[PDB]
């Protein structure tokens, strides 16, 4: 339960994590020359969506990060747990 906010290991994932896109980004530029060379575009004009795809990588990191701060750092479940305990009267004695 307390494994997710490691913080010190979170950093290593990132250089590896953004280096991993570099590998597609490395082939894509050269292959962009091949795609450009082939019939102007070998694939349909709409295929250019492949070039903007890396954005997702940043998106994943953003969401996961927010969750830990919102959850373990801020111990949110406890706030829901107490609200249930006192406002919905789960705790028997207090009610």
């Amino acid at each position: 339960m307390s494994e997710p906010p490691i913080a010190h290991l979170l950093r290593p994932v990132l250089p590896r994590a953004f280096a991993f896109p570099v590998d597609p980004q490395v082939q894509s530029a050269a292959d962009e020359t091949a795609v450009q060379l082939s019939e102007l575009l070998t694939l349909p004009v709409l295929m250019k969506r492949s070039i903007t795809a890396p954005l997702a990588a940043h998106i994943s990191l953003v969401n996961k990060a927010a969750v830990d701060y919102f959850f373990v750092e801020l111990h949110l479940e406890a706030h829901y747990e107490a609200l249930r305990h006192f406002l919905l009267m789960e705790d028997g004695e207090f009610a």
């Binding site: 019939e39 694939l43 349909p44 709409l46 295929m47």
Partner: protein, 144 residues
């Protein structure tokens, strides 16, 4: 029609070369075109009167691809190669990225609805059976 342009250009060079060349000389050099041009005319004339639409043009030339003049046959064949490029181009997507890209024209494919073959338009030389495989691949990619 490009070679006709080159030929006319060349004649001038000879006239520049010599100041007195008979018209008959002109008749001889341009007389290979005297026959190809009338023929290509009907290929277009059919297109305008019948309001041939979309791929149906691909067949209209192909039926005149059986022409009894060897030059005309080679001449028209070049055009079909050019036109196929687009068809190959539109088929390059529906089969691949599962999306039709057509406004008013068609590539013989009209979810699991709005997507079906147009028998009228289908070119004859392409067999109906292969078209079904194509339809299957595009619908297949579209669903997943």
């Amino acid at each position: 029609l490009q070679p006709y342009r080159q030929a006319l250009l060349d004649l001038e060079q000879e006239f520049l070369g010599d100041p007195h060349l008979s018209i008959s000389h002109v008749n001889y050099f341009l007389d290979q075109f005297q026959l190809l041009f009338p023929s290509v005319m009907v290929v277009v004339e059919q297109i305008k009167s019948q309001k041939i639409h979309g791929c149906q043009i691909l067949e209209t030339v192909y039926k005149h691809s059986c022409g009894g003049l060897p030059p005309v046959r080679s001449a028209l064949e070049k055009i079909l190669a050019v036109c196929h490029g687009v068809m190959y181009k539109q088929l390059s997507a529906w089969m691949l990225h599962g999306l039709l890209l057509d406004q008013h024209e068609e590539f013989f494919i009209k979810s699991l609805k709005q997507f079906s073959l147009r028998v009228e338009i289908l070119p004859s030389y392409i067999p109906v059976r292969v078209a079904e495989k194509i339809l299957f691949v595009g619908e297949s990619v579209q669903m997943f």
